[PDB]
Design a protein around this nucleic acid. Structure first.
Ligand code: ATP
Ligand code: ATP
Ligand code: ATP
Ligand code: ATP
Ligand code: ATP
Lengths: 362, 362, 362, 362, 362
DNA sequence: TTTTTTTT
């Protein structure tokens, strides 16, 4: 009798494993009897204990195969092919739908029976989120939908604001919920051609603060950014496809993704200003600085800039109807838990602790 | 009959051998009758003499095969696969506990009946090391915990200061203890691709005497070191995953390992300086040299570079409860052996001899 | 009937051959009847005529095979594996002891019945080198010890002197004796990657006339030498492992071997001066030149730059007890043969002639 | 029935062919019925017409093979393997002897009945060459001895003179005589890596028209050559092996060949001047020009470039004793043939014509 | 039943195809029923309709093969092998004779019954070209012989004159007639290396439009080319071999091919002037311009660009004895066609019209 | 796939 290549391929699909070594390693673990399997008994890892008993007979024969890496290479191809199909076929909303469902799986397990971070800390995370600026959940929801629609011109917001104003901290966090990258335009125009290639295939993008050419009138350093960006008419508009470039590599073309421009409190051409839907001046805030100094568990469990923290803020504020239609069930199922475990008073109290800069958990 | 690839792969696992040439050479030694094997008789290498009798029959049949490198390739991939599975599943504490078991097994041999090392010399090494900086064991205990907790923007400590001030000496001992990697960045910005590629699946990394720009007024030549350092601060923050390269293999994404950086008293952008929890500056002391000059077996046997010396130091200084739980059995067993073999007065004799700059053994 | 891959592998072990083309070429020669083999009758190459009769029967079947390069590849891998195993398990003293046995075997051939070398001419070379510096044989013993002990950051010797000072000549003989490699560093800082990759598993290295800067004041055209080397301080220090690269191969990690650097009298950053444990200064001396002019067979046979000549010097000058215990047997036979073949008065007649700058022989 | 790979290997060996495509295309020609082969019947190519009839039957079966390029690859390997065996085992004298045997075979064809060459035209070339420098044939003999002996730091000859003075003409003939390669060092310092790679296994090399810097007073266009070349001083000296590189290939290690440097009349750094064992001035002369204008069949047939011309000069001038012992038999036969063809008066008449600047013939 | 690899190789040989994909695609088309094949019925492409009926049976089995690309590779190799045999063995006269046969085959189609060309319009082309220079037909015949004999120094021709005076038109037709490549030497000196790499194995080269320096007074834009050419003396004189490079390939060594240089009226150094056999002056002539206006089917169909036009000019003007002896039989048949198709009065009326600057046809 | 080319 012989290895079923089919069963190996199922496991790769189910785990969504797409590293051949990782697939090989884990599947070999099943070769011992599941009947006594201590990893199963300890319930350490679902990717093991959910599967061992089913795969056991096949894994034994797999361990005797002389061909093992070849089996795994085909299985990894299957998962990569699946991704490339979906990546071409599906809508931006379907794509965001799936990423929500993915992060809602981390929501599921992180506070599952292992509880390996206390959900309450993430409530305090939500508190130090929603303090930041007016209606912060709605400002998120608005900018999120703006980026899903990817409507031409209506695509770029201007995060003005000085040093440590938090703009980078927030925009970086949002890319967990979506994926993307940040960019540089202060490096001179000969380099810029290659800098632009970093935007390729990004679901979202962001820009570094312009060291704007005029900013040293404000004593804000003047790299090439302002005149560079003011000249890049289409890229912001996303009206048509454009070419993009990388070292040692050929050109490619697509519509240039939507995004964010951050800056310090720079001077700007009215033409470049006309490229933006919004401008906001972020600022450091005197409660918030001391509150973080007093609330550092939010940094320790890596809460603050997690998409999971944005996801909770979103789940807490936003109506079920505002979410991806089928996932709305899962949204109810978490509105259940979050409002079950946490009163509005502790939530309000936590926000009031920020409202006085005292440490959030109290 | 035919080769058991299974028996080959077991040896590769139990040696934890992960080089295909090394494995091939090793296994071919077993083709002779262990009945006369001089290496067995000499008890020359455990990786041989423990296994020769068991594998002899299979090695004879292996010696005739025409597939020999292919057999070894599959066996090596099994070992790499095991590492990759541990890499993602284990806690950083669990990793460290494994690492310590490996070192303890080696010490069991080194000071065993084979006994090629004598612990008095290594204890003199401990004395020299604990003399090198105040409360050395305690500063080590801090670094270990910091490295296990892996707190972002706090993942790195920097050593500054003149040559021959021991920063390398200490880095070497810690790196052996942790099983990290050294890395270089004083290099073409592009070629960092595979260099950082080595950071795949490592607990810890070290960057050596990396070059500032300016300070050549003090005979410190400018170089790409500090450029590449103050660039890549995300790798020092560690809040961010990076995709890492190897030849003829996929790129793989992970959080970059935490680490140590070292320099002489170069220039350093404050933007980079922000990343380091401790930034300690190392400077020479001469009585150490006079001791070394009189104690040169310390350097000749590289004792003061070994992580083994640090582990001996931690056994001597730290409470049993400060160790990870499972090994505390072995900790106690070694504390017995140390405190049995050495009075404190012997350790005093050593340590004042060190401080006095006289030969430690006396 | 079929090819024995085993017999091929033995021949590669026997010859220590490790180029697949050289292996293939030489094994093919055995296809003709050794009974008639003109090369055997000439007794021209030992690696042929020792083996032809044994391998003839298998070579006839190899000559028909369709796999030939594959059979040779496996054999070369077996030899390379043996090197890897030895490199990881021998003491440096055993490695050197093996190297000396190989040279002694060549000497047995050279001065054997085939006797192509004249031991008088070779001993004249010993007199010339023993004259080149004070206490020459003592200096060689010091260097050997230093390379065997391999004390970290006490690992490199610097040779300085004007052109035709003889520093290259001395370095060449030492390099043959220990079997290192020479390397160039007066080079662009990128391709150093594959250049230094040659040092993998080598016992010793030499860097040549390494170009400094500001040298035109002394008519030394400046270059990248000193610039590059004061980067690689760790490679000199040998305090930690480093990663070495080859084409189509992933990096190998190991300590970088000890060695020698040669220098016309450029400037030196003391960051670099710190790492040479010793420097020797060389001077042109015209009477040696007159001797060479009258004694051209020294150069034509390259005698004065062969490690064979250094070995003969050591046999003449050093106690038998200084040699590693096993070869002391062979050493005694060569001491006897030398004392038989030369009176001291003949050697004194030579050293006198060398001092006079007359042709060595009279 | 099946293809004899052995017969293909024989054909490759006998034709000394080492291009897989040329070997393939050649062997395929034999598949047509030998008895009609117009290439045979017109006696156009010895590499065809000697072999077609022998190889015919196997060529027909080879034409049907599904495996054709694999068969050719194996055959080409054995030809390459033989070259490497020879490179490591022949004396430099034997190499030159073999090279001479090959040219002498070509001369048997050129002046055969099938031979198109006019021996009188080729002998006219020798007259022109013997005029180009004093004691021309003695100079050739001295150069040959120098190349055979390959004495370190006494290995390189420098040619200089005005443009149109004869220098590359003479270099070309020596290079065809000995075999070797020309190289251009007036380059950026990076691609020197692959440029110098060409020297692998070569006997001679020639550096072509190395450019100095300054001396544009003498209308000399400046370039990298001299300053660049002075960095490679050890490649000239040849005291020690060096490492050489080809595209997509690992570094080879060997001693860098001896050879010739050509330039117009720049000045030379005496670090490099010291390395030239001999220097030859070339000067324009009117009678050579006027003779050559009236003797253009010399140029039209490339006579004065070609190694056959230098070989003919040596056969005329040098004693039989000076040739390596085995070729003395063929040398004697060629001497008889030449003396039978040309009286001394005819040769002296030619020389007098050249001196008079009339066309060589009369 | 089996695929015949032989029948594929015959098709590849007969089509002279040497792209695997082009070979593959065309063979697959034959799998459909030849008897109704629409492409056959249209007589659309000779590479198809001549062959479909023959290969149909094998194409059907080929369509089921699992080895398809492997079969094609071996076939394409056979075509490439034929080219290298030819390149190394044919005389330059035979090369040209082959090239003419290819053009004559295309003309048989073009002016066939299926032939879409009009022999009258193509003869109008010849009338215009014969007016472009005095003695045009003799000038071509001289150029061809100069290329065939390839006599050193006597190798290169210079085309000179104002912009829009036809020089590149004539170069292009000659380049099509002989086969060859254009090259641009106006580059900086570094990239010239890969540029000249294009010349490998070519028959002719054209140096397009080399820019001088100065003559900006005459509005001529300056550039490197003239200086670069003056630095390539040996490539032009073609007396000795040179090394040539391609991307990702090792160098090859050959005589650099003969060719043409073209320029506007820059000043030419005498060093460069001496390199050229012949200079041809091109001048604008209004009557050609007004003729082209009223005869633009010449331009539209690219008639005056084509080597096919020049071949017709040779056939009309040259005696049959001037052609290579084998093709003289075809030449007579084409002369016979042309004599039947045009009286001299018809042709001379066209020449008169061109001299009037009137449209060619009346 | 890298290496080489590109990049610089
Ligand atoms: N309101 C705030 N007041 C003070 N500190 C803050 C505030 N918000 C965030 N921070 C802290 O400051 C860090 C830096 O913030 P961030 O980089 O996002 O600011 P920035 O405005 O984009 O800065 P810069 O203009 O200097 O690039 C944050 O990661 C957080 O630790
Ligand atoms: N504080 C010290 N006092 C005296 N000797 C020291 C001291 N620290 C190190 N050494 C000696 O200096 C030599 C090198 O030590 P080490 O490489 O660790 O220093 P370093 O400061 O890291 O040097 P570098 O800057 O060259 O890397 C060793 O011989 C070591 O014993
Ligand atoms: N001390 C000496 N006195 C005189 N002649 C010497 C001396 N040493 C070497 N020679 C001569 O100089 C030649 C070259 O010697 P060597 O290459 O070893 O010198 P070097 O100083 O290392 O030179 P370089 O800097 O050119 O590499 C020797 O072959 C010998 O002919
Ligand atoms: N000594 C000479 N006197 C006169 N004419 C010469 C002389 N030597 C060569 N010639 C002519 O000069 C032509 C070019 O010679 P050669 O190819 O050796 O050129 P070069 O300028 O001397 O060398 P290079 O190009 O290497 O600098 C010869 O083909 C011949 O026509
Ligand atoms: N002798 C001529 N007299 C007038 N017009 C001409 C002549 N030769 C060419 N033409 C016109 O010039 C146009 C371009 O010709 P062509 O491209 O050969 O010119 P060129 O001067 O050789 O160009 P370039 O130097 O830019 O490559 C032709 O299409 C035709 O219209």
């Amino acid at each position: 009798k012989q290895v079923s290549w089919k069963l190996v391929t199922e496991y790769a699909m189910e785990t969504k494993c797409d590293d051949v070594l990782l697939l090989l390693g884990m599947y070999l673990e099943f070769q011992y009897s599941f009947e006594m399997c201590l990893k199963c008994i300890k319930k350490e890892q679902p990717s093991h204990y959910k599967y061992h008993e089913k795969h056991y007979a096949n894994a034994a024969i797999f361990a005797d195969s002389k061909n093992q890496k070849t089996i795994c290479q085909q299985a990894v191809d299957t998962v990569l092919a699946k991704k490339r199909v979906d990546s071409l076929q599906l809508t931006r909303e379907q794509m965001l739908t799936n990423r929500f469902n993915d992060l809602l799986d981390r929501m599921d397990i992180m506070f599952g029976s292992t509880g390996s971070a206390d959900i309450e800390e993430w409530m305090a995370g939500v508190a130090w989120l929603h303090c930041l600026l007016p209606k912060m959940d709605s400002v998120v929801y608005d900018f999120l939908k703006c980026m899903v629609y990817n409507i031409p011109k209506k695509r770029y917001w201007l995060f003005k604001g000085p040093i440590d104003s938090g703009k980078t901290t927030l925009a970086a966090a949002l890319l967990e919920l979506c994926g993307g990258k940040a960019l540089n335009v202060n490096l001179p125009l000969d380099r810029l051609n290659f800098e632009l290639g970093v935007a390729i295939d990004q679901f979202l993008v962001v820009f570094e603060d312009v060291k704007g050419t005029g900013g040293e009138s404000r004593d804000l350093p003047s790299g090439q950014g302002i005149n560079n960006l003011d000249n890049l008419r289409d890229y912001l508009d996303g009206s048509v496809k454009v070419n993009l470039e990388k070292k040692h590599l050929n050109k490619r073309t697509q519509i240039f993704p939507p995004g964010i421009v951050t800056m310090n409190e720079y001077s700007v051409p009215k033409t470049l200003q006309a490229r933006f839907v919004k401008q906001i001046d972020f600022r450091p805030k005197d409660y918030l600085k001391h509150c973080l100094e007093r609330s550092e568990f939010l940094l320790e469990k890596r809460i603050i800039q997690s998409g999971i923290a944005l996801l909770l803020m979103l789940i807490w504020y936003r109506p079920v109807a505002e979410f991806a239609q089928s996932i709305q069930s899962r949204i109810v199922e978490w509105k259940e838990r979050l409002d079950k475990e946490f009163s509005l008073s502790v939530y309000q109290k936590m926000k009031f602790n920020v409202a006085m800069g005292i440490g959030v958990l109290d």
